[PDB]
Amino acid sequence: EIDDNRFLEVTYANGDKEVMYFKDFNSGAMIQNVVDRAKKNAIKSVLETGQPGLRIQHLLDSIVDEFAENEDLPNTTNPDDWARISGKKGERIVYIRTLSNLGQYL
Amino acid sequence: IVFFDEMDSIFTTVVPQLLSEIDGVEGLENVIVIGASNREDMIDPAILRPGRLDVKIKIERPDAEAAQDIYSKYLTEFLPVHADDLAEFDGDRSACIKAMIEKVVDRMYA
Amino acid sequence: SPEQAMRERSELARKGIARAKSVVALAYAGGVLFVAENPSRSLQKISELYDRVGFAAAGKFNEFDNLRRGGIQFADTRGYAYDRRDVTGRQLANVYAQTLGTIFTEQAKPYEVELCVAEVAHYGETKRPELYRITYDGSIADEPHFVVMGGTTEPIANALKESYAENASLTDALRIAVAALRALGVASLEVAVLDANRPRRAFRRITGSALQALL
Amino acid sequence: SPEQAMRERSELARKGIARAKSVVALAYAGGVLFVAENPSRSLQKISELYDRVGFAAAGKFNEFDNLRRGGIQFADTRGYAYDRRDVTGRQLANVYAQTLGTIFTEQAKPYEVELCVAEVAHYGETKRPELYRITYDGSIADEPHFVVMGGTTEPIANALKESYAENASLTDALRIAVAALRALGVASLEVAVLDANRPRRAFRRITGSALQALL
Amino acid sequence: SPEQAMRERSELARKGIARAKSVVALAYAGGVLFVAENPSRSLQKISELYDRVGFAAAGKFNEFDNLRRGGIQFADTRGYAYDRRDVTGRQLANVYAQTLGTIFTEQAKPYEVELCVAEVAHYGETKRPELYRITYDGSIADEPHFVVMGGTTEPIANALKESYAENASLTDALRIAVAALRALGVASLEVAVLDANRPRRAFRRITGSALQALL
Amino acid sequence: SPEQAMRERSELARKGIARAKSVVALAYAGGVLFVAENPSRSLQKISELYDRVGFAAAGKFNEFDNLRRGGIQFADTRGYAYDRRDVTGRQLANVYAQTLGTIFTEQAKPYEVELCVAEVAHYGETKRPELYRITYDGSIADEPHFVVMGGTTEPIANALKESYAENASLTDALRIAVAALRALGVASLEVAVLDANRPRRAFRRITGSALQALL
């Protein structure tokens, strides 16, 4: 629940803002992508240093690097799948938010 | 090599079919899928997801130096040259061609 | 649809408050301290409202200066109609809440503003500083220690959460507030206090060389 | 279709009342008791309306406080125009019955408020406490024993249904009301009474250490 | 959609400011210098506002002359209501900003105008000239050295950036301003100064043969 | 697109001015000469505005007569409020420009009119005649020699370009103006002058047998 694994910010009809982390979107394909990215990082490390091994830090960094590239888990406007999570919540989901010369702002 | 060009024109649609075919051809590592698109912003990030099309490479315009290179590739040394222009370089055809390429590139890049 | 558009203003307004500068207000030994990130020398975001009531804001200026003026108007009309010691920070905060709610559900565009009304005790009196935050919804919240308005409020709010100390002197509270605000010289800071020790008018700006010495 | 628009207004008002804290009002030996779940120290949901008429509300603060103010205005104008003993809880309830109907049919968004008007007898007089509930529909329900407003009303209403006892003392009615409300300390409760024994102004808040002793 | 209306209003006003002649205002030893490219002999884009406050504009003539008139009105009403030395360039600039924030969001068509309010010190007094620029949105910018309005501002601004020199005489600042403006004779230039040396009314036009000698 | 709709508005006004007759005004030795092609004997397109200020128009009669009346109103209210010699052709032209711009942007249909305001010097005074042309949008142009309004303006404007001569007498300027207008007898011409030699009221119609002798 730390704010290092923030994924999405959802504002409901009630106006309650909730941070949905990766825990609510851990699909198996996402785990596969995490493992593949970690293995690619291992390739880079072994070709940079030469030591034939895989570090835990590789997977730990791949965890946060997984969502640096979009996985299609968030959607524009209100997703139908979100209307399903909204039904479980009991509050309609209204705002999905990832985590000039127009007047004067102070 | 299976190459696709002008893929910014396209992308519930044909995208899932393309992804399924790419996953099917993934077993054939010898076949290399190469896509081209001048508008990376319009390309649907679904194809940009990790996995299939991981490697993205940017390309650039011909730089002055690249223009001199490309001009040399067509304006080779075997093309006929004027005698008066040879008088400025004592009959050195390669040097004359290089100077002419430099001159035309400089004028066009001015 | 009331849900799409009464709420539609809520994103609009939230976005406007984020493209602004950050202001903090915190309690210290001598009263309350306002520290805002402000480059201009003419336009301000901290103001006296009444004898012991101060005011800070963040967001579209034509809007929070409109509120600044309205609040001044209100407070003086009350103080004259009844008496000076009858106008309280609580009334002012409540009026701002009603007014920001009425703009939220009637005007075309919601006021992209965030307000903080501050009050200290009278001279020779004893009482804790009161901070209220009024949002664009019309919502009002009672803060015990500090208010952070405008921009990205999370890092500043957390830095203040670690550094805050009740009964910190003026210099310590200034260091804490500038430090947490960084998460800037006298040419980019607007600093004022609600000095509880003044006899009547408690608001007092700290600018120039005096500000230079304090920080 | 006004048939469908009215339906979305009624649902919107119902959701707003549910999205709020809970208030109870019940009759006891000395008059009527209001017990509300209220965290703020400045914002109040229980109020004196006239000498013997009290008022509790649940919903949107700015709106039921708008009604609070309107009712105060009404009652005082009547009392001065005729006399104090002519203003009755019944008139007040009726005025809020018609104002909430007019708002519900004519204004953009219906008020999301639920009202309870309470009345006790005059000093040295004998008469049963009267409770009225006015909904956003403008319907007025005459309650003999207790009113529950805002949030989830079923569990509180049932707990009161089992625990209620006529002529319970002030402490027993407070225990029953807090217990049924739980279905909270002095820092999260707003408690007041319509004490039938007072000579003129019956409304009386119970806060701080006295409240601490009572509960 | 608030966003589309804002981006549509913004690109039309801007397609009007760049669709007009260019004006420059810069500080020099004796005060501030306005140099505008103006062919007509009757229609003017530089004007006195108050004793020490001048005004230049670029855009749609009827509208910035409407603002010219409103500002004159304002300044004189203040000067008479309080005193002459109380009206400052800062107040005027602020009023124009509020007015261009209200026109842009409330009227049908935004004003396609760019304003520059200038102020110098009083007679026998010492203080740096102040230049403010008010955009059609309602934003105000504090300028230390020079303002360029209307038409292709960037090429003219680039030249002034190289040629500007503080405390340049009237002739040098005129040469610099006309030169950077070219990036025109007395029959196509409108030139005026805010001469800080005048006792009261600082604004003074430079036309005809005197202008001929200066350039 | 409002901008494309504005192109339609401009076309509609231009169509109306073309669907009409032609008027010319030119400077000559004794002042300014108005020569219009006008069949009616009651409806006129040339008028006195003030002592030395005349007026000609082309388009829709009811509207340019509305402007005629408004201008008369304005000029007399000024002359009485200040003095006669204070009303100038320049003020009048400017008022017509503001008014036609406001009409062109705010009213349903734009005024399909084209105006020419003329001014000469006072008696025993020396100064060149001034001609201004105000178009339907609010644009105003300063003319040194002659104005042509309504219908097809190109051939008349060119014929005048070849035939014009400064300081031409009244008869020569009349011949030039009628000739270029043909590119008509006393029963189809409206002719008037702004005779600079008159003591006060300079406008003077030339009709009937006197007109017969002049042409």
UniProtKB/Swiss-Prot annotation, chain A:
Add the further remark from the entry: Was identified as a natural substrate of the M.tuberculosis proteasome.
The name this protein carries in UniProt is: Proteasome-associated ATPase
Mod. after translation: Mpa thus promotes its own turnover.
Chain positions covered by the region annotation Docks into pockets in the proteasome alpha-ring: 105-106
Q: What are the disulphide bonds in this sequence?
A: none
Q: What happens when the gene is disrupted?
A: Cells lacking this gene accumulate pupylated proteins. These cells also become hypersensitive to reactive nitrogen intermediates (RNI) and are severely attenuated in both wild-type and nitric oxide synthase 2 deficient mice. Moreover, they display increased resistance to hydrogen peroxide.
So what does this one do? Answer: ATPase which is responsible for recognizing, binding, unfolding and translocation of pupylated proteins into the bacterial 20S proteasome core particle. May be essential for opening the gate of the 20S proteasome via an interaction with its C-terminus, thereby allowing substrate entry and access to the site of proteolysis. Thus, the C-termini of the proteasomal ATPase may function like a 'key in a lock' to induce gate opening and therefore regulate proteolysis.
Its family remark reads: Belongs to the AAA ATPase family.
UniProtKB/Swiss-Prot annotation, chains C, D, E, F:
Q: Does the keyword Iron apply?
A: no
Q: What happens in the null mutant?
A: Cells lacking the core proteasome prcBA subunits exhibit reduced growth and persistence in mice. They are also attenuated in interferon-gamma-deficient mice. They also display increased sensitivity to reactive nitrogen intermediates (RNI) and increased resistance to oxidative stress.
Biological process (GO), any one: proteolysis involved in protein catabolic process
Write out the annotated subcellular location: Cytoplasm
Q: How is this protein's activity kept under control?
A: The formation of the proteasomal ATPase ARC-20S proteasome complex, likely via the docking of the C-termini of ARC into the intersubunit pockets in the alpha-rings, may trigger opening of the gate for substrate entry. Interconversion between the open-gate and close-gate conformations leads to a dynamic regulation of the 20S proteasome proteolysis activity. In vitro, chymotryptic and tryptic activities of the proteasome are both completely inhibited by epoxomicin and by the peptidyl boronate inhibitor MLN-273. Also inhibited by Mg(2+), Ca(2+) and SDS.
Domain of life of the native organism: Bacteria
An example of a Gene Ontology cellular component annotation for this protein is: cytoplasm
One annotated GO molecular function:
threonine-type endopeptidase activity
Q: How is it used?
A: In the course of search for new antibiotics, a class of oxathiazol-2-one compounds has been identified that selectively inhibits the M.tuberculosis proteasome over the human proteasome and that kills non-replicating M.tuberculosis.
Q: Which residues carry this modification: Phosphothreonine?
A: 77, 171
PROSITE patterns given in the database record? PROTEASOME_ALPHA_2
Pfam families (UniProt xref): Proteasome
Other remarks in the entry: Was identified as a high-confidence drug target.
Sequence similarity = Belongs to the peptidase T1A family.
Primary role: Component of the proteasome core, a large protease complex with broad specificity involved in protein degradation. The M.tuberculosis proteasome is able to cleave oligopeptides not only after hydrophobic but also after basic, acidic and small neutral residues. In complex with the ATPase Mpa, degrades protein targets conjugated to a prokaryotic ubiquitin-like protein (Pup). Among the identified substrates of the M.tuberculosis proteasome are the pupylated FabD, PanB and Mpa proteins.
Query: Which PANTHER family does the record match to this protein?
Result: PROTEASOME SUBUNIT ALPHA/BETA
The protein, known as? Proteasome subunit alpha
Name of the gene encoding the protein in the UniProt record: prcA
